[PDB]
């Protein structure tokens, strides 16, 4: 009973979370997941500022109201070569990664590793935070409040 959460640097408090190395988070799960990091789904404004500080990914993830990819460099296989916060317009499917926003994080680039999941609750899952540098933090708990996300 294990969940891997790959996380990134924070940029103006915004970061990306990928669950189990696949697009596998629902919108409800994403809000609960960010809540476990004492975080919220970023607003479009928060994501734009994060982008201006150096944030980009090549993965669709939830923000408040939309599913986006922040892009700095145009890459043909990431957000169809677009730059800026690319908004997913048409998709059949509902599961993506998520972005999260931690208001207490540093204002610009914070590429230190994540060493806690401070607001997860009691549960049976071994949740492992996997940083880009491989370092890991694991704890037994749960963050999913909606049964259909479990
Ligand atoms: C040992 O099994 C479990 C332990 C804890 C939980 C999570 N809680 C969270 C609060 O509400 C009740 C369940 C689930 C479990 O089995 C699916």
CSV table of C-alpha atoms and ligand atoms in Angstrom, one decimal:
chain,number,residue,atom,x,y,z
A,1,UNK,CA,0.0,0.0,0.0
A,2,UNK,CA,2.3,2.7,-1.3
A,3,UNK,CA,2.1,6.0,-3.1
A,4,UNK,CA,5.1,7.8,-4.6
A,5,UNK,CA,4.8,11.6,-5.0
A,6,UNK,CA,7.5,13.1,-7.2
A,7,UNK,CA,7.9,16.7,-6.3
A,8,UNK,CA,9.9,19.6,-7.8
A,9,UNK,CA,11.6,22.9,-6.7
A,10,UNK,CA,9.2,25.5,-5.6
A,11,UNK,CA,9.0,28.7,-7.6
A,12,UNK,CA,7.2,31.5,-5.7
A,13,UNK,CA,5.7,28.7,-3.7
A,14,UNK,CA,4.4,26.7,-6.7
A,15,UNK,CA,5.5,23.1,-7.3
A,16,UNK,CA,4.6,20.1,-9.3
A,17,UNK,CA,3.5,16.7,-7.9
A,18,UNK,CA,3.3,13.6,-10.0
A,19,UNK,CA,1.7,10.5,-8.4
A,20,UNK,CA,3.2,7.1,-9.2
A,21,UNK,CA,4.9,8.2,-12.3
A,22,UNK,CA,1.7,8.5,-14.2
A,23,UNK,CA,-1.2,11.0,-14.8
A,24,UNK,CA,-3.3,9.6,-12.0
A,25,UNK,CA,-4.7,12.4,-9.9
A,26,UNK,CA,-8.4,13.6,-10.1
A,27,UNK,CA,-9.3,17.3,-9.4
A,28,UNK,CA,-10.7,16.3,-5.9
A,29,UNK,CA,-7.6,14.3,-5.1
A,30,UNK,CA,-5.4,17.2,-6.2
A,31,UNK,CA,-7.0,19.6,-3.7
A,32,UNK,CA,-6.6,17.0,-0.9
A,33,UNK,CA,-3.0,16.3,-2.0
A,34,UNK,CA,-2.0,20.0,-1.9
A,35,UNK,CA,-3.8,20.3,1.5
A,36,UNK,CA,-1.5,17.5,2.9
A,37,UNK,CA,1.5,19.8,1.9
A,38,UNK,CA,-0.3,22.8,3.7
A,39,UNK,CA,-0.8,24.0,0.2
A,40,UNK,CA,-3.6,24.8,-2.2
A,41,UNK,CA,-4.1,24.5,-5.9
A,42,UNK,CA,-2.3,27.5,-7.4
A,43,UNK,CA,-4.3,30.4,-8.9
A,44,UNK,CA,-3.5,31.3,-12.5
A,45,UNK,CA,-1.8,34.4,-11.2
A,46,UNK,CA,0.3,32.4,-8.7
A,47,UNK,CA,1.3,30.0,-11.5
A,48,UNK,CA,2.3,33.0,-13.8
A,49,UNK,CA,4.5,34.4,-11.2
A,50,UNK,CA,6.1,31.0,-10.5
A,51,UNK,CA,6.8,30.8,-14.3
A,52,UNK,CA,8.4,34.2,-14.3
A,53,UNK,CA,10.8,32.9,-11.6
A,54,UNK,CA,12.0,29.9,-13.6
A,55,UNK,CA,9.2,27.3,-13.3
A,56,UNK,CA,8.5,25.0,-16.2
A,57,UNK,CA,7.4,21.4,-16.5
A,58,UNK,CA,6.5,19.1,-19.4
A,59,UNK,CA,3.4,17.7,-17.6
A,60,UNK,CA,-0.3,18.6,-17.4
A,61,UNK,CA,-1.4,19.4,-13.9
A,62,UNK,CA,-4.3,21.0,-12.1
A,63,UNK,CA,-4.3,24.6,-10.9
A,64,UNK,CA,-7.5,26.3,-9.7
A,65,UNK,CA,-9.9,26.2,-12.6
A,66,UNK,CA,-7.7,24.7,-15.2
A,67,UNK,CA,-5.2,22.0,-16.3
A,68,UNK,CA,-2.0,23.6,-17.4
A,69,UNK,CA,1.7,23.3,-18.3
A,70,UNK,CA,4.0,26.2,-17.4
A,71,UNK,CA,6.5,26.7,-20.2
A,72,UNK,CA,9.5,28.9,-20.5
A,73,UNK,CA,11.3,27.3,-23.5
A,74,UNK,CA,9.4,26.2,-26.6
A,75,UNK,CA,9.6,22.5,-27.0
A,76,UNK,CA,7.5,20.7,-29.6
A,77,UNK,CA,6.6,17.8,-27.3
A,78,UNK,CA,5.7,20.0,-24.3
A,79,UNK,CA,2.4,22.0,-24.6
A,80,UNK,CA,2.7,21.9,-28.4
A,81,UNK,CA,5.7,24.3,-28.5
A,82,UNK,CA,3.9,27.1,-26.6
A,83,UNK,CA,5.5,29.3,-23.9
A,84,UNK,CA,3.7,30.8,-20.9
A,85,UNK,CA,1.1,29.0,-18.9
A,86,UNK,CA,-0.3,26.7,-21.5
A,87,UNK,CA,-3.9,25.8,-20.8
A,88,UNK,CA,-5.3,22.4,-21.8
A,89,UNK,CA,-8.4,23.0,-23.9
A,90,UNK,CA,-9.5,19.7,-25.2
A,91,UNK,CA,-9.1,16.3,-23.5
A,92,UNK,CA,-11.3,13.3,-23.1
A,93,UNK,CA,-9.9,12.4,-19.7
A,94,UNK,CA,-9.9,13.7,-16.1
A,95,UNK,CA,-6.6,12.5,-14.5
A,96,UNK,CA,-3.5,14.6,-14.5
A,97,UNK,CA,-0.6,15.5,-12.2
A,98,UNK,CA,-1.1,18.5,-9.9
A,99,UNK,CA,0.5,21.8,-9.0
A,100,UNK,CA,0.4,23.0,-5.4
A,101,UNK,CA,1.1,26.4,-3.9
A,102,UNK,CA,2.7,26.8,-0.5
A,103,UNK,CA,2.4,30.5,0.6
A,104,UNK,CA,5.2,30.0,3.3
A,105,UNK,CA,7.8,28.8,0.7
A,106,UNK,CA,10.5,31.3,-0.4
A,107,UNK,CA,9.5,34.0,-2.9
A,108,UNK,CA,11.7,32.9,-5.8
A,109,UNK,CA,13.4,29.6,-6.7
A,110,UNK,CA,13.6,27.1,-3.9
A,111,UNK,CA,15.4,24.0,-5.2
A,112,UNK,CA,15.9,22.5,-1.8
A,113,UNK,CA,14.3,19.1,-1.3
A,114,UNK,CA,10.9,18.4,0.3
A,115,UNK,CA,11.4,16.7,3.6
A,116,UNK,CA,7.9,16.5,5.1
A,117,UNK,CA,4.2,15.9,4.3
A,118,UNK,CA,3.1,18.1,7.2
A,119,UNK,CA,-0.7,17.8,6.9
A,120,UNK,CA,-1.4,14.3,5.9
A,121,UNK,CA,-3.8,12.4,8.3
A,122,UNK,CA,-3.9,9.0,9.9
A,123,UNK,CA,-4.0,6.2,7.4
A,124,UNK,CA,-2.5,3.0,6.1
A,125,UNK,CA,-0.5,4.1,3.1
A,126,UNK,CA,3.2,4.5,3.0
A,127,UNK,CA,3.5,7.8,1.2
A,128,UNK,CA,6.9,8.6,-0.2
A,129,UNK,CA,7.9,12.0,-1.3
A,130,UNK,CA,10.5,11.6,-4.0
A,131,UNK,CA,12.6,14.6,-4.9
A,132,UNK,CA,14.3,15.2,-8.2
A,133,UNK,CA,17.6,14.5,-6.6
A,134,UNK,CA,16.4,11.1,-5.4
A,135,UNK,CA,16.1,12.0,-1.8
A,136,UNK,CA,13.1,10.6,-0.1
A,137,UNK,CA,10.8,11.2,2.8
A,138,UNK,CA,8.3,8.5,3.8
A,139,UNK,CA,5.4,8.4,6.2
A,140,UNK,CA,2.5,6.2,6.9
A,141,UNK,CA,-0.8,8.1,6.4
A,142,UNK,CA,-3.5,9.2,4.0
A,143,UNK,CA,-4.4,12.4,2.2
A,144,UNK,CA,-7.5,11.3,0.1
A,145,UNK,CA,-10.8,12.4,1.6
A,146,UNK,CA,-13.0,11.2,-1.3
A,147,UNK,CA,-13.5,7.4,-1.4
A,148,UNK,CA,-13.7,7.4,-5.3
A,149,UNK,CA,-10.0,8.6,-5.4
A,150,UNK,CA,-8.8,5.6,-3.3
B,1,LIG,C1,-6.0,0.2,8.7
B,1,LIG,O1,-6.8,0.7,7.7
B,1,LIG,C2,-7.1,2.0,7.6
B,1,LIG,C3,-6.6,3.0,8.5
B,1,LIG,C4,-6.9,4.3,8.4
B,1,LIG,C5,-7.7,4.7,7.3
B,1,LIG,C6,-8.0,6.2,7.1
B,1,LIG,N1,-8.9,6.7,7.9
B,1,LIG,C7,-9.0,8.1,7.9
B,1,LIG,C8,-10.2,8.7,8.7
B,1,LIG,O2,-11.4,8.0,8.5
B,1,LIG,C9,-11.3,6.6,8.6
B,1,LIG,C10,-10.1,6.0,7.8
B,1,LIG,C11,-8.1,3.8,6.4
B,1,LIG,C12,-7.8,2.4,6.5
B,1,LIG,O3,-8.2,1.4,5.7
B,1,LIG,C13,-8.6,1.7,4.3
